[PDB]
Amino acid sequence: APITAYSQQTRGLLGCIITSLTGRDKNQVDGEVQVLSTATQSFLATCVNGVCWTVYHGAGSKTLAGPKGPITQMYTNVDQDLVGWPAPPGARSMTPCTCGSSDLYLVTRHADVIPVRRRGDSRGSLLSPRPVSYLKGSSGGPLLCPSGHVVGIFRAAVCTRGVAKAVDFIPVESMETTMRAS
């Protein structure tokens, strides 16, 4: 595959509990994708045009801990399972893909890059199936075209008996709609 990734951890269990309570994160931010956590779940945010986008079923209505304290959501759409906070400064903002390619790449929280075949506006087949457990925690993760532009973010896995054969995602078009409607 063309696209590669790696991760870097920035916080541990105690620091996360504290930062959650204070809402103030002074760590330098970097990367195209942020790995997020709350008290109960982990998920990802993809930063696209100055906004870091993730799923509602992960973030709910919560603020994001920021350098100036908690950041309020700029966009909240419960029915599309989409939320967005203004992107922290060091976050590397990605570009929306508009040509729409056939072959897509899902970036997981493990920084693995998984080949996906687009099947429609918001659906993509895994070229080889993976355990559900392997994708869990990667909601909000980007689906990219080979060029590295973002076509959508990971929302739900299509699976049977613990095996995922396809993914449902929120298309960048959805992000347009939410921003305009607000």
């Binding site: 696209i3 590669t4 990734a5 790696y6 991760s7 870097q8 951890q9 920035t10 916080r11 541990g12 996360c16 930062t19 959650s20 309570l21 204070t22 809402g23 994160d25 760590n27 931010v29 970097d30 990367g31 195209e32 994708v33 942020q34 790995v35 997020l36 956590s37 709350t38 008290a39 982990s42 990802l44 992960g58 973030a59 919560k62 603020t63 994001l64 801990a65 908690p70 922290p88 590397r92 990605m94 970036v107 929280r109 920084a111 990219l144 590295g148």
Partner: peptide, 13 residues
């Protein structure tokens, strides 16, 4: 009242 917290990042190339 708890905030969502960045615990890591992923760098693309």
């Amino acid at each position: 009242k708890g905030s969502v917290v960045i615990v890591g990042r992923i760098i693309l190339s």
